[PDB]
């Protein structure tokens, strides 16, 4: 009940984890999902555990789709560990690029005001009452307006990856959120 040697080596080379950390995360992954394939409902259950005082269902669905690389409706361990690596230990640039993919719902190379608003409304639902909101950003629409004011340099209503990267790095509050390693 362990990973084959070849897979351990492969996954270690593709992530910021060590061999022992990979084998350890697999033990926990298998314990919760014995088949090794996480379903949308199971992934939903996990996110409900991160945010018990809100509704993470909509956001969890968007996240599930992004990191289901091969789009087969299941998150296998290889997809899980690589997602976890970028999201928990990646550099700022690598995290930003996965953040862009999440906001680019149709993967067409632009984030529209409507694509972003859908995600941000999911984020506000997920938080719930667990974050006091300044009045100037107490709605998804207000947050989106501020973001596109800061980042849409050509004012075409869409964000390229270049606009999203430079705009995010300009805001000290965004830089901090994307510069953590194991939550620190
Ligand atoms: C280690 C724990 C905090 C964690 C995370 C996480 O790090 N999230 C985190 C939060 C913030 C920043 C970075 C990471 C994720 C976790 C979940 C989703 C995405 C990323 C990490 C999970 C986890 C839960 C259920 C699963 F099916 C698999 C893993 N788990 C739980 C694993 C644990 O059930 C092992 C099991 O053996 C214990 C038991 O059965 O009693
Ligand atoms: C679960 C965790 C590893 C995660 C994911 C994710 O879904 N990964 C995952 C893992 C395995 C399988 C599938 C998915 C994404 C994550 C990243 C991109 C898109 C969707 C989710 C993030 C995360 C990282 C930086 C951000 F700016 C925001 C969120 N994080 C880290 C969140 C953490 O910074 C929250 C913060 O509020 C707490 C703190 O201050 O430490
Ligand atoms: Ca998959
Ligand atoms: Ca798009
Ligand atoms: Ca633009
Ligand atoms: Na590694
Ligand atoms: Na996408």
Keywords:
4 strands, mainly alpha, EF-hand containing protein, binds ligand 117, two-stranded antiparallel ribbon, metal binding protein, Recoverin, domain 1, 184 residues, binds sodium ion, FDA ligand, monomer
How many domains, in number, for the residues? 2
CATH architecture of the largest domain: Orthogonal Bundle
Radius of gyration (CA) equals: 18 Å
* Number of helices in the DSSP assignment: 10
Number of strand elements: 4
In which order are the strands of the major sheet placed? Answer: 1-2
The small molecules bound here are:
ligand 117, calcium ion, sodium ion
CATH superfamily of the largest domain: EF-hand
- Shape summary: globular
Distance between the ends: 32 Å
Kindly state the percentage of residues in helix: 55-70%
Q: Please state the structural category.
A: mainly alpha
| Oligomeric grouping of the chains | monomer
Highest-level CATH class of the largest domain: Mainly Alpha
- The CATH topology of the largest domain is Recoverin, domain 1
Describe this structure in words.
Ca(2+) 3 binds at residues 152, 154, 156, 158, 163. Belongs to the recoverin family. This protein is mainly alpha-helical and 184 residues long. It folds into two domains: 7-91, Recoverin, domain 1 (Orthogonal Bundle); 92-184, EF-hand (Recoverin, domain 1). It has helices spanning 5-13, 19-32, 40-50, 57-67, 77-89, 92-103, 113-127, 140-151, 161-170, 172-177, and strands at 37-38, 75-76, 111-112, 158-159. The protein has a two-stranded antiparallel sheet with strand order 1-2. Strands 3-4 form a two-stranded antiparallel sheet. The longest helix has 15 residues, at 113-127. It is globular. One sodium ion (NA) binds next to loops. One ligand 117 binds at residues 63, 67, 80, 83-84, 87-88, 95, 98-99, 102, 177-178, 180, 183.
